[PDB]
Amino acid sequence: FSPYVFNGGTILAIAGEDFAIVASDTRLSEGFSIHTRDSPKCYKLTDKTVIGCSGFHGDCLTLTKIIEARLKMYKHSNNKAMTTGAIAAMLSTILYSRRFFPYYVYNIIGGLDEEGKGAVYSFDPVGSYQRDSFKAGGSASAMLQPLLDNQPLSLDRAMRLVKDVFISAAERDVYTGDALRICIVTKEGIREETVSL
Amino acid sequence: MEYLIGIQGPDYVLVASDRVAASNIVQMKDDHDKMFKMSEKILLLCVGEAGDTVQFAEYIQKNVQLYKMRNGYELSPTAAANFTRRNLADCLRSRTPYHVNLLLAGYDEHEGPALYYMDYLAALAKAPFAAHGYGAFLTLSILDRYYTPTISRERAVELLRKCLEELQKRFILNLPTFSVRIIDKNGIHDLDNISFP
Amino acid sequence: ERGYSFSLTTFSPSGKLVQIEYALAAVAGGAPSVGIKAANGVVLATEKKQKSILYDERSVHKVEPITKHIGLVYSGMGPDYRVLVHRARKLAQQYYLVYQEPIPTAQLVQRVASVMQEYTQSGGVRPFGVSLLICGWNEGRPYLFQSDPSGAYFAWKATAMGKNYVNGKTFLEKRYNEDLELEDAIHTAILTLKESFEGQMTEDNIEVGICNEAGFRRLTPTEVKDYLAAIA
Amino acid sequence: MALASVLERPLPVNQRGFFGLGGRADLLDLGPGSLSDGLSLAAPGIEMLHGTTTLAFKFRHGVIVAADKKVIEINPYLLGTMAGGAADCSFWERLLARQCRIYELRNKERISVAAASKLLANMVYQYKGMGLSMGTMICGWDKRGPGLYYVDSEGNRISGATFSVGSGSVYAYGVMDRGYSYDLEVEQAYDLARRAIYQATVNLYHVREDGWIRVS
Amino acid sequence: AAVSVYAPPVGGFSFDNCRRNAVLEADFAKRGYKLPKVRKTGTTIAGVVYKDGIVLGADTSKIHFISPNIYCCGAGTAADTDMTTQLISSNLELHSLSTGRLPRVVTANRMLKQMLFRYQGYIGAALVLGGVDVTGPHLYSIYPHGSTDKLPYVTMGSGSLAAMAVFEDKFRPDMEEEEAKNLVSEAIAAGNIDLCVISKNKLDFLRPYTVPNK
Amino acid sequence: MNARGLDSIPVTELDLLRKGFSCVKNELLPSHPLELSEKNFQLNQDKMNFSTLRNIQGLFAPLKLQMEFKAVQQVQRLPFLSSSNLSLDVLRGNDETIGFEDILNDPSQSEVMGEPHLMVEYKLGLL
Amino acid sequence: SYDRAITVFSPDGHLFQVEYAQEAVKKGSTAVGVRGRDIVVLGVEKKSVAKLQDERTVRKICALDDNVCMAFAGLTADARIVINRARVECQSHRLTVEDPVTVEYITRYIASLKQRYTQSNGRRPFGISALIVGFDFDGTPRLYQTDPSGTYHAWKANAIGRGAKSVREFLEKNYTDEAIETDDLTIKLVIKALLEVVQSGGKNIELAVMRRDQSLKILNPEEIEKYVAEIEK
Amino acid sequence: SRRYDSRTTIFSPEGRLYQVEYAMEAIGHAGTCLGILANDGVLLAAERRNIHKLLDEVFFSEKIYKLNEDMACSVAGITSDANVLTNELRLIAQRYLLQYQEPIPCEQLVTALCDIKQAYTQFGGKRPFGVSLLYIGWDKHYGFQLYQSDPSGNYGGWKATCIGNNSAAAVSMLKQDYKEGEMTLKSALALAIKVLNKTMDVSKLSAEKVEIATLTRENGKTVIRVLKQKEVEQLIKKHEEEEAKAE
Amino acid sequence: YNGGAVMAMKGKNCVAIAADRRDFQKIFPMGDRLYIGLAGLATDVQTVAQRLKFRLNLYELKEGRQIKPYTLMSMVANLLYEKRFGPYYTEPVIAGLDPKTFKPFICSLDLIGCPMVTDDFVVSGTCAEQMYGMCESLWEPNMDPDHLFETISQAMLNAMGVIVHIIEKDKITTRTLKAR
Amino acid sequence: QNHWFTYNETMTVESVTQAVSNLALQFGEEDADPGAMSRPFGVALLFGGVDEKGPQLFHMDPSGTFVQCDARAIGSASEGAQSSLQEVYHKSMTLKEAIKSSLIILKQVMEEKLNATNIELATVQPGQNFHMFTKEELEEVIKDI
C-alpha cells in the first residue's frame, strides 16, 4: 500500500520591477490515463500573493486549505493582512513540521513586497526556501531551466517569453495540459486569462 | 581502533590511553582526551561509539559530584564502580545499537589502590591489569608474562613501552601518541607523552 | 470542646484523636465474644443476633475460616467484617502462591492491621467500626491475637470484647489456668459467655469454633448442645 | 453534560455519535487546530550540499571562516556553517538564534560560544538515528577570547584551532597546516585562507571583538 | 531516593531484556555458541469417561491437582503448566470458600481458556481437564492458543496415534470402572503408568465445603 | 475479548539529570507483541465494559461507574507510599481473583523510589 | 475574616497569609552576610547551646556548589528541602551548559520554587528566608536575599532573623570602602556586627569564609577566639 | 487561638503551626525511652507499657526494632504509625544497599525518613505522624552515633537524650551525671538504671518492666543483643545495694 | 565466553558444591549453611545474585527467622519467572542444610524456574550430559565427608582449576584443587 | 520571540498587549489546566513602543482588559497625577517638554526629595531602540526643573 501517487504538472514564475507572473498547465493525470483536461494549479491567497503547487493532488488540496485557515487566523489576531515574506516563513515552518513523513508537493510563491517590487520564492518538500528572480518547477523543470537561463524585462516581453516557453515545453512533455493559465499581480490588483494550447 | 591500558602497583595505578579521534568527514588534529575526572582520586576512561561515551561520562561525573556536595564526603572507588555498573546496565537495554567500554582507576586511604574492568555487557571485575582495543589479548598475554605483584613505578612505564613496541613489530603502526597519568595518595599527576618516530 | 470531635484528621489540643475513640465505642456496643488459648488449642465463642425461628441456619455465620489453620470472629459491624475477611483470604492465597507454604498467623495479623490503619489518616473516609480475634496453629504452638480499629494488634491469652467486657475480663482473670486443656477451655468459654447472657442459652443462639493441630473446625449444633448439657 | 464535565478525563464513550466498539467518533474532529508546534511521527528529492568546501581557523586577532549562501549569520556576534541537509541546518540554527536571544533578554548578558554549541548538540542529539544529517562549525568571541567548535548530527562536539570539511578538505587542510601560525597578522591570515581555498578547488568572513564583517 | 523516578512502579511481567537478547542470540548463533534452553515434557497422556466418573492416565506425579473433584494433566513447557495449574487452583479455592460449595468443571475450563487466549498463545500449555460435579462427569481438552473442546475421550503426547486408534477400536458408552482402567492402561502402554480415578460415590455434594490438606 | 485493544513529538515552543537513557527511535515501536497489551489491560477492560453498558442500557450507567471510581480513588495515601486499594477492588469486581500482577514484582517492595515532594508535585500536574 | 485562606484578598488589597508566613522568619537565629572585594563572609549566631549535643548536625551554613553558599533563618525542616532542590538544580545546569552556575540564576530558581507554593489552598508556603553569596565565572562577588513570597534583590551587607534591625543599622553606619580593605578587616567587621546581639562571643557565633577560586572554609573556635581577642584589644 | 487550629496549612498571626504543636504534644503520654553514648558502645533502654496479667510474650521485643545489620531504633507514640515508619526504614536501607553495594550511613537514613515525615505537614488533607524515634548504630565515617526525631520532621545528634513521659527530669539528671569522653558501657548501664529508677515513680523497678539493648563492635562485626532478666536483676540488685550503702 | 559448570551432591549429614576456576565469582553464600551457584552470562549472574540478596534480607528482617532451602528455591523460581519473555541466562543450583533438622538438600533450576529435586546429585552448565554419566558411575550411598570430597573433585577434574565447598553441621571447609 | 521565529517579523504593541492579557483572564477554575492560577493577578502594566502606526501607549488592568491611553498614571498617587496631567497635556508637544512635565508631576507627588537617584527614566524613538537614561543624563535633565 503506497500512500503516494505522482500527478503531472509544470509551474513557472517571473519577478519584475513592479509586477509578478505565475503560470501553470491545466492537466490532471496518473501517468497513462488522463483524469481531467481542466484543473488549474494556481491559487490566489491575498490581493498581492499567489501560490502554485504540483505533485500529489491530495497533499496539494490539504496544504491549500491549511494555508487559508492560517491566513484567516492571522488576520483575526493581528487586525491586518499578512505579507509575502511572512507567508513564506509560515509555509516553511508548516512544511518542516512533517519532516519524517513529508508532503509530496513542490511550491512556488509569487507576489509583491512592501516596497512594491516583485518577489519569487521556491521551496522543497522539506521547507528550504530562498528568494529568486525566476524559477521553474514541476516535472519538466529540468528540461526547461536551461532555456530560461540562456534566454528586468517588461510585462509584454515577459508574457511573450512565457507563452513561447510553455508552447515549446508542451510538445516535448507527456504531462502538459491543453490550456495555459497566467496570473498577473500588479498594484491595481490581480487579473488572469486562459490561453488555449 | 582505540587503545586502553592500565597497570596496578603496590600504592599506585598507572593508566594510559591514546589521543586520536574517529574522524571521517572533518579534518582535525589528533588532540583528544579520553580520560575524565570523577573526583580528586578517581579516573574513568571510555572508548567506543562516538557521541555516547562523552554523554555517559558527563552523567556519571555529575552524579558523583552531586553525591559529594549533598553528603560532605566522597564516594569510595568500589561504590563508584558499582554505581556506574548499574547505570551502564540500565542504559544498555534502552539503546540496542550501543557500544561503550569502561575502565575505572582510583585510590583510597583504607583499602588502597584498585583497578576495575568492564565489558560492553556491563560485567564488572577487579583485576591487577587490563586492556581494551585491537591487540587486547596479545597485550594481556605479554603483561601476564612480564608482570610481578611487587612492581615499581618506572618498570611499569618500561613495560608499557615494551608492550607498545612489541605490538608494533607484529600488527600495525600506532602513529597516534599516548597520554600517561598516575594516581597516588597525593592525587592525579601527569607524565610526558609516549610517541614513536 | 466539640470543635475537634467532627473531623478525623484533627488533633485535639491535648494530643488526642476523638473519632477513633468513637469507633472504639461503636466496637464496645456489639454482641459479646470470647477467646481462650488452652495448652493444645484455641476456642472462639460468640452470640448471634438472629435469635429467631425464621432465620435459615445455612445463610450467614459469624465464625469463618481463612485457611486450613486460621479462623476469626468479630464484634461490631458486619458489613465491615465481610470485606476484611475477603481481603484476608486473598492475602493468604497470595502468600501461599509466592512462598509455597501456609502463612504464619503473625504475618496475616500484621498485614490486616496495616490495611486497617490506612483509613485513619485521610480526610473523606471513616475508620472501620469492627474489632477482630484471630486464632492459629504454627510449629505446634497456638496463637491468639486481637486487632483494633486503630490498626494496633496485641497477643493475648484470654480476652473478651463487646457488651459488658470488663466483667468478662475480670471473670477470666479469676478463673484462668496456664495448664488447661481444650475441653476445660470450652467449658470456661461457655460459662463466661453465659455470664453476660440474658435469655435461655440453646444451641441455636451461640457459635463455637476450635483450632488444634488437625485444623480449624466449626462445631456443629449437635456438638454445641452436647457441650451445653454437660455443664447444665 | 454537567456530570460528564466533572470527570476530568474525556473518554470517547462520553462523546457524541458513539455506537458499537467505535462509531462516528474519529470522523468528528476534522478541524485545522488552534495553536501548537510539534514534529510528526515516523511513517522525495531532498536538497543536499554535496560539492561545497568550507574552511575555518582561529588565531590571536579572531576567527576567519571561508567557503564557496553557505554561511548562516545567526547573530551579529555569532556565525555558523552548513554541511549536509540545508533544511535541517536552517531550522535548528534558527532555533539556536531564538534561544540565544532569550538568554540575552533574561540575563542581560550575551551567551558564550561553549553554551551555544552545547545547546545545539543537545537539540540535535535527541533524534539520533532518525535520519537527520548536518555538520556545523560555530564561531564567536566572548569573555574568554575567540572560540571555535564543530557540531554534527552524530553527537560529536569538539573544539580546536583548525577545521575543514568539504570535498577538497585534505588539500586545504594540508595547506593551512603548513602555513599556520598563532601569532599571525590579519593580512597574512587573509592570504593563507585565500591560498588554501584556492588550492582546495570566494567568500571571506572575519570575527572581531564587536561582531563579524565581510571581506569579500 | 533516586533522582530519576517520577511515578510509582507496578507489577507483572517485565520486558527489559527483549532487544538485548534479540541481538545477543543472533550474534551467538553467528559465532556458533550455546545458550540455556527451556525444559519440555512430551510424555503421552489420556483420559476416558466411564459410567460414573473420570479416569486419567499418564506415563512416567505428572497429574496436577486443582480441586478434590477436578484433576488435570499437562504437556508442553513444564514451568507454564505448573504456573497455570497453581493459579487456577488458588482461584478455585477462593471461589469455593466464598460460595460455600464444591466448584464446577466448566468454571475451571472457562478460566483456563480466557487466560490462554489473553496471553496470545505465547504460554505453551496443552492440558487435559476432567472431573465430576453435581451435573455429572465431564472431560475437556484445552490448547495453547485458547481453544477448548469437549469429548468423551482424549489423547495428547508423542505416542497419541496408537492410543487414539485403540480408543476408536474399543470404546463403548457407559462401561464399568475396571474396563475403563484396563482400556486406559492398554492405550497408554500402546505408545510406569499412573492412574487417577474420580468417582461419584466418594464425593458428597450435600455438605458444606471445608478446606482440604496439601 | 477484554485483552484485545484497539504525531506527539513536541518541540519546546509552547532538568536533564532527572530524565535520561531514552531515545525517540527505540520507543517508536514496542519490543514485544505483548508489551502494550499487558501494560494497558485494565484500561482496555474498563473501556470494553463501558462500551457494552452504554450500548445496552444508556449513558447513565458508565457515567455512574466513572463517578464512583473517581470518588473512591481520592482517599489514598500519598504516591511515595503503598496503598491497599480495598474499595476500588470491591467496586471493580477484583476482590476474589488473583492474577499475574499480584504474585509477580510486588509493588509494595520496589527497588526504586524518588523524592516525596517531587512525586506529589508531578501527580498534581505542576511538573 | 480575610486572613484564613491563601488566595483571598483583603478589602484594602492585602494577602495576610503570606505576611503571617513571613512573621515566622523573624523568630529564628540572626544571620549576617558581608560582601568584600576578594572574599565573602557569612555569620550565624547560635540561639542556644546544649552541652549534650553534637554541633556538627545543627549547622545553619550550607554549600550549594563549588562557588555558591547559603545561610537561612526560619523553619529548619523547611530549609532542608529547598537546599536539596537547589543542589540538584546546580548540578543539572552544568549538564546543559558547560559553564558553572551563577548566583543570580540560582537565586531565581529558589525564588520561583518558593513562589510555586503560594498559589493554591492545598499547600502552605515555606517559612524561611535565605542569604546567598558566591563568586561568578569571571570573578565578581555577589550577595542576594530571598523572601517567602518569592522576591529577590541584591545587597552589599544584610541581616535577617530576629534582632536584625539593630544589626542593619550598625552595618549601615560602619560600612565603608576602607573597612573591607582586607580579609581580616572584613571578618572582624562581621564579628563586630554579630557582637551587638550575642551576649558573649566565641561560644555563640559561627563563621564561614570563602575566598576567590577556593572552596568553603569553616573557622574553628580557636580562630574565632583569636579574632575576638584581637578586636577586644 | 481557636481560629487557627482547623488544619496544618494555616499560619497563626505570629507564625505558628498549632496542629504540629498538638501532634508533638501527643508524644507526652507514651512510655519513656533512653539513649546513652559510650566510648566502646551505645545503649538504648525503654519502659514496658504492656504489663497486663493476661498478655502474652511472642515477639522478639516490644519496642526495640532492627533496621539493618548496623542499626536499631525505638519508638514512642502511636503503634499504628510506628509500624509504617519501621517498614519504610527497612525498605530504604535495602534500596541503598542494592544501589551502592555498601551499608547506608545513619545520618542519611535519618534524613531520608525525616523528609517523609515532613511531607505530611505541608499538603492539606492529611494528618501528621504522631511518633518520635531514637536511632543507634555504627558507621565507618563517624563510629557510634545516636539520633532523635520528632513529628515536626526535625532531627539532631545527641550524646544522651530521652523522649516520652517525664522527659524533662531525665534530661535534667543526665545533663549533670554524664561526663564526656570518660563513659564506658558499665557506667552507662548504671546511669541508665539510676535514671529510670528516678523517673519511674509507679513503684520499685522489676526486671519485667524494662528492656535494654546494647550495640557493640566485636572483631570487624556489629553485634546487637537484648539483655535478659538475669542481667537486669543483677543490675537492679547492685544499684539497690549501692543506694543502701549510700546511707 | 565459556559458561562454566556448577556441581552439587550430598552424602551423610553433609553436602558439597563445586565450580570452575579459570574469571568471575560463581558461588555466593545465602546463609550460615546455605549456598547457591550460578552459571551462564556474567552480567545476569551478578544481577540475579544482587536481587536475590535484596529479597532474602528483607524476608529475614521481616519474619525474624533463618530461611530454609525449599523457601529459597521458591523465591528464586518466582524471581526468574518474572522474565518469561526475554529471560536471564542463568541456571541456578542450590545446596545447603536445614537450619533445624540438619538434613541435606540439593536442587536445580532452568532459566525460567522449573525446579528439580533429587537425592544423589545435580549438574548444571553447558556440558551437563557429558559428565552426568561419570557422576552416576562414581556416586555411592552414604559416604563420609572426605570420600564426598574426592568423588566431587574427580567428577569435576575428569569433565583449569576447581573450588570445592564442604558444608557440615559445625564447620565449613573451602579448598582449591589443580590437576598435574 | 515565538512570533519572530514563525513569521520573520516583529509584533505590534497591541498584539503583545493582547497576548499578555490572554494569560491574566484565566483564574478561578482549578479543575482546568493544572498550571492555572486560582486568584487574579495584582499588578498593573504600561506598554510603550513604536510600530507601523507610530508610537503607541497601552494600559493593562488586573481584570485582564486593556485600552490605549494618550497619557496615563498608575500607582499610589494616580488620581492626583492624572488630574495634573489633564491640565497640561496637549497633542502638539515635544519629547523634551513631555520629560519635563512628567518629572515635575513626579516631584510634586513623591513624599521624598527628587535627587536623580530615586527615579528612573526611559524613552523610545522612531529609529532608535529602547533606551534608559544614565546618571549623567538624569542629572542634566533634573537640573533647572
mmCIF file of N, CA and C in Angstrom, chain E residues 44-47 54-67 70-75 81-82 85 127-130 184 188 193-198:
data_model
loop_
_atom_site.group_PDB
_atom_site.id
_atom_site.type_symbol
_atom_site.label_atom_id
_atom_site.label_comp_id
_atom_site.label_asym_id
_atom_site.label_seq_id
_atom_site.Cartn_x
_atom_site.Cartn_y
_atom_site.Cartn_z
ATOM 1 N N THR E 44 3.159 -39.139 26.891
ATOM 2 C CA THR E 44 1.774 -39.276 26.463
ATOM 3 C C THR E 44 0.815 -39.259 27.651
ATOM 4 N N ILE E 45 -0.373 -38.693 27.419
ATOM 5 C CA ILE E 45 -1.437 -38.622 28.411
ATOM 6 C C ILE E 45 -2.748 -39.000 27.736
ATOM 7 N N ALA E 46 -3.732 -39.377 28.549
ATOM 8 C CA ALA E 46 -5.003 -39.864 28.025
ATOM 9 C C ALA E 46 -6.084 -39.681 29.083
ATOM 10 N N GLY E 47 -7.318 -39.983 28.698
ATOM 11 C CA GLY E 47 -8.439 -39.909 29.618
ATOM 12 C C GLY E 47 -9.689 -40.449 28.956
ATOM 13 N N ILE E 54 -14.425 -40.256 36.010
ATOM 14 C CA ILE E 54 -13.379 -39.933 35.051
ATOM 15 C C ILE E 54 -12.135 -40.725 35.417
ATOM 16 N N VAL E 55 -11.449 -41.243 34.403
ATOM 17 C CA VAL E 55 -10.174 -41.926 34.588
ATOM 18 C C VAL E 55 -9.122 -41.190 33.771
ATOM 19 N N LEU E 56 -8.071 -40.723 34.437
ATOM 20 C CA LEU E 56 -6.959 -40.046 33.789
ATOM 21 C C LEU E 56 -5.703 -40.894 33.921
ATOM 22 N N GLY E 57 -4.890 -40.907 32.878
ATOM 23 C CA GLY E 57 -3.694 -41.727 32.866
ATOM 24 C C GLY E 57 -2.508 -40.963 32.321
ATOM 25 N N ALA E 58 -1.330 -41.319 32.823
ATOM 26 C CA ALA E 58 -0.088 -40.720 32.363
ATOM 27 C C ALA E 58 1.035 -41.730 32.532
ATOM 28 N N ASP E 59 2.128 -41.492 31.817
ATOM 29 C CA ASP E 59 3.291 -42.361 31.853
ATOM 30 C C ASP E 59 4.457 -41.645 32.521
ATOM 31 N N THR E 60 5.257 -42.406 33.260
ATOM 32 C CA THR E 60 6.404 -41.845 33.960
ATOM 33 C C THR E 60 7.624 -41.775 33.047
ATOM 34 N N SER E 61 2.001 -37.686 40.529
ATOM 35 C CA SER E 61 3.227 -37.465 39.771
ATOM 36 C C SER E 61 3.042 -36.356 38.742
ATOM 37 N N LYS E 62 2.752 -36.745 37.503
ATOM 38 C CA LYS E 62 2.521 -35.796 36.423
ATOM 39 C C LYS E 62 1.074 -35.337 36.342
ATOM 40 N N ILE E 63 0.215 -35.806 37.239
ATOM 41 C CA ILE E 63 -1.194 -35.438 37.258
ATOM 42 C C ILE E 63 -1.364 -34.326 38.283
ATOM 43 N N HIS E 64 -1.749 -33.145 37.816
ATOM 44 C CA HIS E 64 -1.873 -31.989 38.685
ATOM 45 C C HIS E 64 -3.179 -32.032 39.471
ATOM 46 N N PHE E 65 -3.223 -31.247 40.543
ATOM 47 C CA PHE E 65 -4.371 -31.174 41.437
ATOM 48 C C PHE E 65 -4.969 -29.779 41.352
ATOM 49 N N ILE E 66 -6.281 -29.704 41.128
ATOM 50 C CA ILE E 66 -6.958 -28.417 41.025
ATOM 51 C C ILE E 66 -8.043 -28.313 42.089
ATOM 52 N N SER E 67 -8.615 -29.447 42.473
ATOM 53 C CA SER E 67 -9.690 -29.475 43.457
ATOM 54 C C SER E 67 -9.919 -30.907 43.915
ATOM 55 N N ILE E 70 -11.576 -32.216 40.792
ATOM 56 C CA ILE E 70 -11.043 -31.835 39.488
ATOM 57 C C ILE E 70 -9.550 -32.126 39.462
ATOM 58 N N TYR E 71 -9.089 -32.770 38.391
ATOM 59 C CA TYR E 71 -7.674 -33.039 38.184
ATOM 60 C C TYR E 71 -7.318 -32.720 36.741
ATOM 61 N N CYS E 72 -6.030 -32.490 36.498
ATOM 62 C CA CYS E 72 -5.562 -32.053 35.191
ATOM 63 C C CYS E 72 -4.219 -32.692 34.869
ATOM 64 N N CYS E 73 -3.943 -32.832 33.574
ATOM 65 C CA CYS E 73 -2.658 -33.305 33.079
ATOM 66 C C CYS E 73 -2.130 -32.314 32.054
ATOM 67 N N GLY E 74 -0.812 -32.189 31.981
ATOM 68 C CA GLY E 74 -0.195 -31.171 31.155
ATOM 69 C C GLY E 74 0.881 -31.727 30.247
ATOM 70 N N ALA E 75 1.061 -31.050 29.115
ATOM 71 C CA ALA E 75 2.110 -31.373 28.158
ATOM 72 C C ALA E 75 2.572 -30.086 27.490
ATOM 73 N N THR E 81 2.946 -24.941 32.594
ATOM 74 C CA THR E 81 1.928 -25.843 33.119
ATOM 75 C C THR E 81 1.803 -25.703 34.631
ATOM 76 N N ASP E 82 2.938 -25.691 35.334
ATOM 77 C CA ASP E 82 2.904 -25.564 36.787
ATOM 78 C C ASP E 82 2.260 -24.251 37.211
ATOM 79 N N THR E 85 -1.586 -24.156 36.453
ATOM 80 C CA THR E 85 -2.320 -25.029 37.358
ATOM 81 C C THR E 85 -2.406 -24.435 38.759
ATOM 82 N N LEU E 127 -3.492 -28.981 27.901
ATOM 83 C CA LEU E 127 -3.984 -29.609 29.116
ATOM 84 C C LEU E 127 -5.126 -30.564 28.807
ATOM 85 N N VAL E 128 -5.269 -31.574 29.660
ATOM 86 C CA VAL E 128 -6.415 -32.473 29.660
ATOM 87 C C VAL E 128 -7.100 -32.325 31.010
ATOM 88 N N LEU E 129 -8.327 -31.820 30.999
ATOM 89 C CA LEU E 129 -9.057 -31.493 32.213
ATOM 90 C C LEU E 129 -10.247 -32.427 32.372
ATOM 91 N N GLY E 130 -10.434 -32.937 33.579
ATOM 92 C CA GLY E 130 -11.537 -33.842 33.848
ATOM 93 C C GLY E 130 -11.954 -33.775 35.296
ATOM 94 N N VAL E 184 -7.586 -47.626 29.559
ATOM 95 C CA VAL E 184 -6.619 -46.536 29.666
ATOM 96 C C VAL E 184 -5.206 -47.089 29.777
ATOM 97 N N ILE E 188 -2.279 -46.348 27.009
ATOM 98 C CA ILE E 188 -1.019 -45.715 27.386
ATOM 99 C C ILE E 188 0.156 -46.616 27.038
ATOM 100 N N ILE E 193 3.004 -46.523 34.629
ATOM 101 C CA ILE E 193 1.743 -45.870 34.303
ATOM 102 C C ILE E 193 1.053 -45.448 35.592
ATOM 103 N N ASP E 194 0.554 -44.216 35.615
ATOM 104 C CA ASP E 194 -0.185 -43.677 36.748
ATOM 105 C C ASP E 194 -1.639 -43.469 36.357
ATOM 106 N N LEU E 195 -2.550 -43.843 37.251
ATOM 107 C CA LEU E 195 -3.978 -43.716 37.005
ATOM 108 C C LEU E 195 -4.629 -42.928 38.129
ATOM 109 N N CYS E 196 -5.543 -42.036 37.760
ATOM 110 C CA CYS E 196 -6.329 -41.260 38.709
ATOM 111 C C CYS E 196 -7.804 -41.530 38.454
ATOM 112 N N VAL E 197 -8.528 -41.909 39.502
ATOM 113 C CA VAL E 197 -9.941 -42.255 39.403
ATOM 114 C C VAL E 197 -10.730 -41.300 40.284
ATOM 115 N N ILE E 198 -11.670 -40.582 39.680
ATOM 116 C CA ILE E 198 -12.575 -39.692 40.398
ATOM 117 C C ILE E 198 -13.976 -40.253 40.228
#
